């Protein structure tokens, strides 16, 4: 019930800890892999999961990221438009995502238009990284091929206005 469940989480992509896995609602003899994921999409990765990213992603030594991972979005800013008008037609959309595994923060930059992440995407939304993902300086290149939005609400207020 423990080792096989951890294997299932690893296969799915999540690299949580044992305490976090048991924290995700796992009623004995009730649910194994689907409901735990269902509640994990709605609970804070910082309070649940374990680190799996390298030690010094932001340093620049890391050149590629391997393995299918899942991370939590903390902030999304349009780096191609000024702060006063965060949305504008002057420049193509380009979002500077901030992502976390619960322990280490990293930054992702969008090359190709991604009609799955927008300025209206709630913080705490989960993004799954598939395949090899390049990092150039301290920034992870994200496109439509290597990013899948899994949704989720982590009980966060508006933090706006």
């Amino acid at each position: 019930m423990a080792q096989v469940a951890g294997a299932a989480l690893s296969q799915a992509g999540w690299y949580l800890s044992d305490e976090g896995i048991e924290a995700c609602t796992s009623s004995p003899d009730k649910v194994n892999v689907n409901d735990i994921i269902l509640i994990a999409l709605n609970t804070d990765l910082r309070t649940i999961g374990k680190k799996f990213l390298p030690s010094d992603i932001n340093s620049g030594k890391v050149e590629k990221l391997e393995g299918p991972c899942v991370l939590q979005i903390q902030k999304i800013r349009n780096v191609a438009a000024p702060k006063d008008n965060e949305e504008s037609q002057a420049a193509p959309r380009m979002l500077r995502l901030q992502m976390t595994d619960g322990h280490i923060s990293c930054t992702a930059v969008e090359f190709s238009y991604m009609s799955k992440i927008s300025l209206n995407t709630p913080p705490g939304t989960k993004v799954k990284l598939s395949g090899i993902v390049d990092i150039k300086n301290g920034f992870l290149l994200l496109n439509d091929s290597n990013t899948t939005v899994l949704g989720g609400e982590v009980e966060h207020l508006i933090e706006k206005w």
């Binding site: 780096v79 191609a80 438009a81 000024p82 002057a90 420049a91 193509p92 380009m94 500077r96 930059v109 150039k136 300086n137 301290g138 920034f139």
Partner: peptide, 13 residues
Amino acid sequence: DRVRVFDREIAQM
């Protein structure tokens, strides 16, 4: 094409 990058680190990249 991707005009007006507003972050120094991204522009340097």
